[PDB]
Design a protein around this ligand. Structure first.
Ligand SMILES: O=C(Nc1cnccc1C1CC1)[C@@H]1CCNc2cc(Cl)c(Cl)cc21
Ligand SMILES: [Cl-]
Lengths: 302, 297
């Protein structure tokens, strides 16, 4: 029993964190085999951030301009290339702590663990989700750039996020490990703003099924709904549309609890209308949307 | 910006998790130097049950390597299995006993394999609101101080309300619990007041000020309100501990107490603080300072 926001054990990722210094800028890098991945904005000045020509700034750099530090050991940069918004620094030593890994691009609603780092030193690990507006509600301070998001399935680390910047509302934007930003964001200090955020409906439903699995049924009702009527109501509460794919994804949880997806959808509709009336669901007074159907199955069953 | 429930990086602890099998029971063990620590319920008269077991009855597995047990002894509710091999991944460590209200990270394990890490608080009723399934026994709670891991908890059991009970690494249970199959219930829980205040300071640091007011209160008047809402009494030590956060934000500790008192009597009124509709009590003043300053390990 119990339901917590749980992160993956960070050990496999800790052994990959290095410090990358270029001029006055110091941030984090991810050392996998003989490559160090980091945000390309490490080559920028604060005077360059508005309209940086990264290709122009990078061509003026040599290997010895990039100082890479793995613990108390300075790694030697022997090559450098840019792939989208990530800088790839070829180093003369392969990381002996390199785990089995993959670079995966995630979709909004997906969750991952973040190993927050400063100066190539890990300071904390937390769980979060890619918001529908492609931002993440993280906890980052200056120097956290290059901190990574990941999932660990079996013994393989799937890297899905690299932190690049904080938007004016305090939310964060970053890229996949191939340098492609999530969302309409650019690594420029130009006025950008996160789009209106929405609630991850399939995740709230997954979390309601987790609550049923842990013995909480107070919110269930005798009603059902069509998928369309649910979407018409839920869009009025800034909830993401629920697709037939989401209904299918919820199938195992529906089978385990005996509550049809559209029946759980009617309970959600009622919860949005009534609120909780001083009650909680899994220790929360708000509808939690940062647990996927996969996270619920993993934590509540194995 | 941002405020998350954040755990310590678990790497130093992951390199210590082993699987311990005794008969039909399999649980987790903590391998430090040449000793494996695990709950003594893996084997009730525990002296009588232990005397009947030999070293080869305990199967200890570190990854795909079987460790050989060369000795065994019991210290309170923890079993100490002397093994032939010292853990090369042994970090700098200490065994510390924590007080209620203190927080720690839990590395949840099944079959000696870490599956997740989460941040917990030792409740005033000595239980933890953890997330554990069968096989999680022997999972450990820890804090990191620079490069030193301070082990503070070992999981032993789940109480009927779904909350968890365990010991420090010397086998002393937190709370009035015993490691036997009998009727055990967690006492009435209370809210960790100093932690709620620390979390209100974290909210101010992140730009949430709606709950602030011009008022202040005495420590006695606040403690009369704290008792009414099942909140732990706030001591002068708690006020002192909150000093740095009071200096940083410009809001005196008793000034924040009047904010808390008004939140307890009036509620949030449809509003949230740090994305929460409830007053959060599982961040200590130190956790707030560490997360709102970026300390590394
Ligand atoms: O955002 C940034 N850092 C950061 C990350 N996460 C959290 C807080 C921070 C610092 C605000 C405290 C950095 C530096 C500041 N400006 C900036 C601008 C651009 Cl275009 C890019 Cl790509 C990176 C940055
Ligand atoms: Cl995905």
């Amino acid at each position: 029993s119990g339901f917590r926001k749980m992160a993956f054990p960070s050990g496999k990722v800790e052994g990959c964190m290095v410090q990358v210094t270029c001029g006055t800028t110091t941030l984090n890098g991810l050392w996998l085999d003989d490559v160090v991945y980091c945000p390309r904005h490490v080559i920028c000045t604060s005077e360059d951030m508005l309209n940086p020509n990264y290709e122009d700034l990078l061509i003026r750099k040599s290997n010895h301009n990039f100082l890479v530090q793995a613990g108390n050991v300075q790694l030697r940069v022997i090559g450098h290339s840019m792939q989208n918004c990530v800088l790839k620094l070829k180093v003369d030593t392969a990381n002996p702590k390199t785990p089995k890994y993959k670079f995966v691009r995630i979709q909004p609603g997906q969750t991952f663990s973040v190993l927050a780092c400063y100066n190539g030193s890990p300071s904390g690990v937390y769980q979060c989700a890619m918001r529908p507006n492609f931002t993440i509600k993280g906890s980052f301070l200056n120097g956290s750039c290059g901190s990574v998001g990941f999932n660990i399935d079996y013994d393989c680390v799937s890297f899905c996020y690299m932190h690049h910047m904080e938007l004016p509302t305090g939310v964060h934007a970053g890229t996949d490990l191939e340098g492609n930003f999530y969302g309409p964001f650019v690594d420029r200090q130009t006025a950008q703003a996160a789009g209106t955020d929405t609630t991850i409906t399939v995740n709230v439903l997954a979390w309601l099924y987790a609550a049923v699995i842990n013995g909480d049924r107070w919110f269930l009702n005798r009603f059902t709904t069509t998928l369309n009527d649910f979407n018409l109501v839920a869009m009025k509460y800034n909830y993401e549309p629920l697709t037939q794919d989401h209904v299918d994804i919820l199938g195992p949880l529906s089978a385990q609890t005996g509550i049809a997806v559209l029946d759980m959808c009617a309970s959600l509709k009622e919860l949005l209308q009534n609120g909780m009336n001083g009650r909680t669901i899994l220790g929360s007074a708000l509808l939690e949307d940062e647990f996927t159907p996969f996270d619920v199955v993993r934590q509540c069953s194995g």
